[PDB]
């Protein structure tokens, strides 16, 4: 439980940088722009997660379905094993049934 | 987001401060002091 003996340098965080000042700027693009583009189009990230949300099993299923043909060998094997484990656990294990 | 406990020092001291007048390893070791302090109370 030995806590550090010296004070750490105080991180000078500016809440008025470009990102923090323009964050969420176009969230109402469809509403205030004669709807043409959904806020889904502003989501930056993996291809199988742009405007989508699910539990771990659904995430793995969607990833294997969308980008499974480009994954590496070990990555695809780990994904298949995770899919199998999540299937068995969610369909056979638990309390509430 | 890895969250670890940083105030464990004080979490341990709040229990060890009630055992400093004991005899043996009950005044030093935490595992033996939590039991001796509960019986004390």
């Amino acid at each position: 439980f030995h806590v550090r003996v010296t004070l750490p340098p105080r991180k000078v965080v500016d809440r008025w940088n470009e990102k923090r000042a323009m964050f969420g700027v176009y969230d109402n693009i469809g509403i205030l722009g004669n709807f043409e583009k959904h806020p889904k189009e502003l989501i930056k990230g993996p291809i199988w997660l742009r405007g989508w949300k699910g539990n771990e099993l659904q995430r793995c299923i969607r990833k294997k379905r969308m980008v499974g043909n480009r994954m590496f060998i070990d990555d695809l094997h780990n994904l298949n094993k995770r899919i199998s484990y999540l299937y068995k656990h969610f369909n056979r294990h638990g309390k509430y049934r | 987001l890895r969250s670890r406990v940083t105030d464990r020092y004080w979490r341990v001291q709040e229990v060890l401060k009630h055992a400093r007048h004991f005899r043996g390893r009950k005044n030093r070791c935490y595992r033996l002091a939590v039991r001796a302090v509960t019986r004390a109370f």
């Binding site: 806590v3 010296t6 | 105030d7």
Partner: peptide, 26 residues
């Protein structure tokens, strides 16, 4: 390395207390 400032400031207070208990000022 544990990310945090509360523990560091609290231990600074503890160090000041130990210093006062060791060398009592006039």
């Amino acid at each position: 390395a544990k990310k945090g400032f509360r523990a560091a400031y609290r231990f600074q207070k503890e160090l000041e207390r130990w210093r006062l208990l060791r060398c009592p000022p006039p």
